[PDB]
């Protein structure tokens with residue numbers, strides 16, 4: 001017994017909705033969202049997860065590509081970014097304006113690459129208060145993101161190869 005629905009589980013969103021599901025439990029934060037950079041430098045709305053009391057940010061499509069200047073390369077090397085508060089970052093520039101609405105008081109990012117390529121990044125925002133990430137929590141969370149590459153690598157290839165069939 002495992003519910004036919006479970007066996008028929010093959011939705012691309014399922015595998016994605018899961019990662020974030022664990023992230024919340026793993027990081028033990030208050031809010032978490034998944035975003036990637038498609039061929040438009042736009043934060044792809046992979047999956048959005050917001051704890052009770054907070055609205056769904058999925059209604060907000062990351063307009064800021066951040067592609068400008070150096071940045072993508074930062075993750076291309078597996079750089080770790082931990083900002084207790086994006087408020088003390090890039091002042092006098094576009095940030096709080098687009099970050100205030102989401103009520104994101106904490107910003108944590110971890111690089112996720114596939115076959116030496118940039119796919120996306122997992123972010124965890126605490127809407128209740130800014131928390132200092134734990135050395136172990138960062139590594140564990142980074143592992144969760146790296147895992148997605150394992151699946152994507154298989155599907156991304158198999159899915160594409162299938163069409164070439």
Ligand SMILES: *[C@@H](C)C1=C(C)C(=O)N[C@@H]1Cc1[nH]c(/C=C2N=C(/C=C3\NC(=O)C(CC)=C3C)C(C)=C\2CCC(=O)O)c(CCC(=O)O)c1C
Pocket residue numbers: 035043062063064065066068069071081082083086089090093094095107109123
């Ligand atoms: C303002 C939007 C802007 C313009 C215009 C521009 O040309 N550059 C600058 C973009 C920018 N933003 C940061 C800092 C951060 N970026 C992220 C990641 C995101 N971009 C998004 O659109 C979203 C969706 C919510 C995210 C999550 C984050 C988390 C930060 C802050 C944390 C940190 O890195 O400390 C920068 C970096 C500043 C620099 O120039 O070095 C730039 C250029």
